[PDB]
Amino acid sequence: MKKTYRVTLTALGPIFIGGGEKLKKYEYIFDKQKKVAHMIDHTKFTKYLLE
RNA sequence: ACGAGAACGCAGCACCAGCUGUCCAACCUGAAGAAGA
Known part of the structure; x- marks a missing residue:
């Protein structure tokens, strides 16, 4: 039988996908002073x- | 001076009436936008 399981994930470190x-x-602006x-x-x- | 002469086998008549080319069926299965040192 099929059992669903709600999953919660807390990234202890930084995660990048x-x-x-x-x-x-x-395509982006970077103010070097304020990081x-x-x-x-x-x-x-x-x-x-255009304007 | 022909058992012969003359004489439309012709006239009217819908191969037509009713009937779903329909019923059942996932474009589906598996795959880290990821890794040197």
């Missing part, structure tokens, strides 16, 4: 470029 790779900053990286809303990015 990839979905894509990007080179130096083209903060911003990902640009790409459709709003192209609307802004």
Whole structure:
């Protein structure tokens, strides 16, 4: 018989699963002073470029 | 000066009426977006 089991996972360390790779900053912004990286809303990015 | 002369085997008539090319059936099975030193 089939028995379901709800599973909870707590990452003790950092866990990374990839979905894509990007080179130096083209699809994101990196403020080196504040150690903060911003990902640009790409459709709003192209609307802004058109504007 | 023919057992012969003259004489449409012709007229009207729907190969037509009823009937599902239908019934059953997962595009499915397995696979770490991942690793040197």
